[PDB]
Design a protein around this ligand. Sequence first.
Ligand SMILES: Cc1cn([C@H]2C[C@H](O)[C@@H](COP(=O)(O)OP(=O)(O)O)O2)c(=O)[nH]c1=O
Ligand SMILES: Cc1cn([C@H]2C[C@H](O)[C@@H](COP(=O)(O)OP(=O)(O)O)O2)c(=O)[nH]c1=O
Ligand SMILES: Cc1cn([C@H]2C[C@H](O)[C@@H](COP(=O)(O)OP(=O)(O)O)O2)c(=O)[nH]c1=O
Ligand SMILES: Cc1cn([C@H]2C[C@H](O)[C@@H](COP(=O)(O)OP(=O)(O)O)O2)c(=O)[nH]c1=O
Lengths: 390, 390, 390, 390
Amino acid sequence: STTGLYAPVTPAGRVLLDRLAAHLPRIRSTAAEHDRDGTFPTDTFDALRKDGLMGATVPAELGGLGVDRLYDVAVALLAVARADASTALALHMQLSRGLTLGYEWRHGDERARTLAERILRGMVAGDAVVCSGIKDHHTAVTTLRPDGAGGWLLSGRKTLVSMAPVGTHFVINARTDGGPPRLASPVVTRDTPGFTVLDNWDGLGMRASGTVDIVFDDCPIPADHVLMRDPARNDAVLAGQTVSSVSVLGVYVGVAQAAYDTAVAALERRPEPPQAAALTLVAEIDSRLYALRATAGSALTAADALSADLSGDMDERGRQMMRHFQCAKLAVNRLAPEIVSDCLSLVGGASYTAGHPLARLLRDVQAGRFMQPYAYVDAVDFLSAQALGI
Amino acid sequence: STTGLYAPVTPAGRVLLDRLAAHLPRIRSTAAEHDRDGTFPTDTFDALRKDGLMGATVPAELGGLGVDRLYDVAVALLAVARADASTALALHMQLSRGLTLGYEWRHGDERARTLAERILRGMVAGDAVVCSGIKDHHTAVTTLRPDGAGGWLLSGRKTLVSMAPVGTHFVINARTDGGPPRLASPVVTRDTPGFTVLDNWDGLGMRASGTVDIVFDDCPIPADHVLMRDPARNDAVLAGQTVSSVSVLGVYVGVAQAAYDTAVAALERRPEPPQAAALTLVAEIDSRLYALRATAGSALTAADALSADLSGDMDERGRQMMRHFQCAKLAVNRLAPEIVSDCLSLVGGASYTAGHPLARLLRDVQAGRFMQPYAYVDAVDFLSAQALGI
Amino acid sequence: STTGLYAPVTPAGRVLLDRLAAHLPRIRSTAAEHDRDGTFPTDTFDALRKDGLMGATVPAELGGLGVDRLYDVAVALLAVARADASTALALHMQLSRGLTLGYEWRHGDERARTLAERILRGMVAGDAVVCSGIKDHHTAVTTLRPDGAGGWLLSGRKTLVSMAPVGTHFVINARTDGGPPRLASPVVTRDTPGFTVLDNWDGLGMRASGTVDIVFDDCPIPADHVLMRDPARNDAVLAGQTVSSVSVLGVYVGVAQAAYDTAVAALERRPEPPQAAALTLVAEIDSRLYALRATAGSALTAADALSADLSGDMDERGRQMMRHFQCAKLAVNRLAPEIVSDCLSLVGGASYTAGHPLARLLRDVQAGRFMQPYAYVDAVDFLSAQALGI
Amino acid sequence: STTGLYAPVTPAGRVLLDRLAAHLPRIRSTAAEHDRDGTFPTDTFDALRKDGLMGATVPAELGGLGVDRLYDVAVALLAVARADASTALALHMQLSRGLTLGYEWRHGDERARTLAERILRGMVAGDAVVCSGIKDHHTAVTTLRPDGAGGWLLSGRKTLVSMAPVGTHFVINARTDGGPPRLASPVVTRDTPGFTVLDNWDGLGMRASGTVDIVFDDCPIPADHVLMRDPARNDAVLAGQTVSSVSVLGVYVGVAQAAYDTAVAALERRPEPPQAAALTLVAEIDSRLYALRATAGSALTAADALSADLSGDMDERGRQMMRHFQCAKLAVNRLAPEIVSDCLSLVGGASYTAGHPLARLLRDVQAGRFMQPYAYVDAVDFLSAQALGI
Ligand SMILES: Cc1cn([C@H]2C[C@H](O)[C@@H](COP(=O)(O)OP(=O)(O)O)O2)c(=O)[nH]c1=O
Ligand SMILES: Cc1cn([C@H]2C[C@H](O)[C@@H](COP(=O)(O)OP(=O)(O)O)O2)c(=O)[nH]c1=O
Ligand SMILES: Cc1cn([C@H]2C[C@H](O)[C@@H](COP(=O)(O)OP(=O)(O)O)O2)c(=O)[nH]c1=O
Ligand SMILES: Cc1cn([C@H]2C[C@H](O)[C@@H](COP(=O)(O)OP(=O)(O)O)O2)c(=O)[nH]c1=O
């Protein structure tokens, strides 16, 4: 199978999915409690760490499983999400960081490569859990200031940092302010002075994903723990943002799958044969889920092809990767919640009590809409700009 | 204004809405806490009781405000629901019971009239809070058994009984089992032996509505506290079920209104002018909300006209009332959640944290789908049967 | 019945609908031929003229039937449209002109009143068939130029002028160019020199509606055949544009009704009982048609109420009338074509051959989308401007 | 590119698409006239015949181009459909017959192989144009009767036979009636006595596709021109029906593409920058078209994989092929017409006149809904049966 995210397409992808199977039963078992209490499943992550799955996307050269297709990462996230979407969303941050650090390792200058290499062997060993602090909190602009002696001091606050509760290393999007301002990616470790992880995530869904705020109060960062980016429009950069986020589409596809599976099981348990409207819903969902899978799957296949090809116009490459990502994302964010919603009509009133799985899937399935890049309102400006050559 | 539920159409309806205004600020203020904890707002109901609003739909002959249009009851529920939908849903059970007891009073035999009259002056006084126990729990069929001395013993369990926590009187749908079986409406009071109110409502939404189970363990009911119904298809009965439930459409209309109002306020608070997709969403919502209001409003106007006219074929009357109700209900249950959902796209990520009002409106707005009569799957069998003359 | 356009709400409205019934059978009978050939049904209009129905909306003071509610005009258009939508669309231009000329008659200065009065008794007599030339063709800006002796010369070209083939009088939106420019409504009669009616309408639907272009080549117009308007934003003018166009919503409602009626008749003719998907479609359509009727009906009731009340802020009055019109129009233009489309799924492949009635209804039902004011793209700018107080 | 039908995936597929390019300009040029008059473009087909493209899917062993992927056939149909959908729909019947005859040739008994081989070299040479007469007209059940001397006589009538006007050979689905009844595929040639091609296709769309009825009045068919099928449920047969029809999804995808391309060109031609609603429509269409392509493309890739694998349970193989086909078909038949419809909103009123390309695309895009297998109502019974293991 090379379509619909039905199966991994490479040998490493298969091993990844086989190894994950052992962990599914714990993931499913504790999901309801962590959602109710809003707490991160630290024990699931301890098991994945010692089992080496936290290094799944580290290059085999460095001792990792060598998963290097986005498509296979999404197939694994989908399987995890059918068990618990919060765990999948947190796992995606680790897996996709494996992929972009792997590219720094192979194409960065010596500073990037050395640093990337250290983190990547960390990930395999179980010692490095890598979170991404991307979006500034509204009270703050996260800035790096020279320390006077050749290093830096980082101040600010980032929001919505998933997996933060077990994070050991945090890649932070910041700008300088000591040249003219440049974008920089300092890496802060958890024991850096001035560094606090807050405990303030209270989600409608993704309740267990640890999607908290992190605060930097003059955190000393040494020069070789900073990847300087640039200044300045640069489309080629869209490619890294795609690699960073596109596989997360597997999460919302798995949520829709688990809703459908729940609804069908419910219908089969009944003495009465399904009513006319239930048969029609089932057929409509079956086809919508197919179109959901085919759309995520194809944009993932296309993204993997463009990702592997470095031989051309890098700006065109980044626009094309982002256009595949965004076209598919908008479709996913409309289809997945529609499917989940229609599933509640099949099960009926039992799905409206707080503990039923569908009631949680209805909350978790909404989270994709708000994840940048891009939320709906911004996606429409991006897409119409690209389509009309603005 | 005679359309869209924009304003009450009778003098008593206006008084009702004016008097409710005093209570809105407490209702809005405590909504978040009661949703979080899942607890019934007993203090709001204490205030409505002593203010006489719990008698709003009692005939003026008996000292009530004399609200007798469904349309005006829905206009009042809408205003309450913009403050808190759980409170509105519970209030609807009291108000619509005012209307069906008022019909028992004017058209019942002497047993019904006497009993109805006692309860109705109760409601005005603040002493009677009347809940409806309609749907059997799956473990039980609620049955009335003769006690050997001319009275009855009631056993069973009813589910989803809103307002039960403050209920003093419970109208219960039961069947006999001492003739051949008949449908009977015994009225049980809270201090009857064998009668328990459970504390088991844990909703995805409508969390504060007190929608709990109630249990009957050989509850002694005297003969004059039982309204015997019949055996046996009887379409005329559809009219009472319509009167009982149709005004609750105002609840879901108010939820959609409060979502839109929230979204618009959010857009106006921003320094930036809205993006192209936000302007288009606003226009689409504005028109969808209009169609939502016009559909609920017209079915309520039509229901009031048919309700008042007793001069014809009573079976045709009941089919027509139920057809207006069900056509409008299906539209309401698709339009209202769509509006609320689109509102989250306007506000963006802040609406996905557990405390934001939209996150609660998204949960509460789903409840209409599951309320009988009829849930989606059964509505489709009813409607296609009527349209095709089956 | 006061809702859903199910029945006229005034005695004159009832007479109008009763009198129209005689003409329905010819209208239905010739519809297919006129659609195929693209030709205007001149014989239907000859019959309506001599029967006096072309004066239905002329004040009884002047010998007309005195229909003065938009709601009743829409109920009559709906009945005509179930027979043929092109005939209804052309009839709407006559009927609504009855209403706006009736307002000129009662509130214009002596020039307007005298002219309005002459035309209105024309309409009753069968001698005046009044078309509206509103939109400039792209090659031309229709301008009135003083003739040097106290009258005017009209040049330009208007497009999409329905009913033009039998039109005797044409109210034309023009601007002066002899003060500073003003808007003017010259009335041109068919025998004016320089005046040509073209024969260039080739519609996907509304094929028989005579929606042709008309050309003015220095047409001499006397001063008392010109209603001068103003210069300059003026919201009060929205009220006349609403009166002019809002009742045409009945046309698209009748098209949806005739599609549903066709589909249901088709299902009842079959030996087999309907499949599960057909029962579900029937219920969905039944409810969508209800919401369609309730939305058009309520905006028509609201428009009639605001129309009759001249006692207040005239600018607020015009914004409110247009907002009711536009909210309802957007809903109508999405719901009506959806219903018609779903009807083809019920009938199946027979509805895809050129002669089946549904194939024509699918074409005619699209025309509302393109009629100003406002087409979809402009409606969204109007509605979001009003909702956000821009 | 291996997704979205953006490009053929094999060398023969590329040659096919390159060779077709020469013919596109005539196809586009004559489309409007053939739609207006309802006439088959015999000259386009004469050119494809002599150019050998009518043999594109004949095995290279027999002198054909050897196109053997459904995916590449759909990529070619899409390119043709952007020029004219009727021509594509007719071409699909020839191309897919290349594929199922190619399977008879390689896996049939000697009767099938010999006959298949003769026809297939015909197709390459330009001498054989192969139509499929599948669906019985309602007045007739098409039956083969033994002629008493070892051959057969064919009577009946088939409907909706596309390409019939230039057809030289007609594969007919029939049942015997001389054992117990069996299904048989007699092949009738155009000069057989008793064989008439009628001239009765009058479509809302696909007007030029020659989709006429054909009549058999005791047509003598020799025994070696009959492929006997079986009696009796047999799921394995679903695989041939899939191969026969699945590539036609490319037709409706090309129609949606040509609508979008038209709309975008229209927006770019305007002096004014697009309004807020137009930008939002453009982004929504861009994403819907992506999901349309990804869904058709993936079901075509999956169908090609299952088609090539003959090594397993043949009944499971046929259920899986048909399930991919039907899931995708239902999505295509909702997405493609929605896109085309939204395109008319972008262009506005010009798209409602009979000659504008969008007005034709709106008609042609509806045809997929009615093509078996399966039309919507039957697809829902098939899909819900498969999903619920009925
Ligand atoms: C350009 C490019 C970058 N990357 C990786 C290397 C960088 O670490 C990373 C940048 O990702 P991200 O942080 O999402 O981009 P930004 O810095 O714009 O927020 O992406 C790829 O994996 N592939 C690529 O083609
Ligand atoms: C027949 C009818 C009943 N009613 C009232 C009187 C009865 O108390 C009540 C029955 O309502 P309900 O309990 O909803 O009906 P059922 O007994 O079928 O569950 O409805 C009306 O208000 N109007 C009517 O026309
Ligand atoms: C202001 C107003 C005008 N009218 C009528 C009188 C004018 O003849 C007519 C103007 O309609 P119309 O031609 O649609 O407006 P415009 O001149 O802006 O195109 O509307 C009403 O019927 N009611 C009103 O309240
Ligand atoms: C079983 C099978 C048949 N075919 C071809 C061989 C037969 O000629 C043809 C039957 O197609 P079709 O006529 O669509 O099936 P039916 O006879 O049920 O109408 O399909 C394949 O191409 N692949 C297959 O796997």
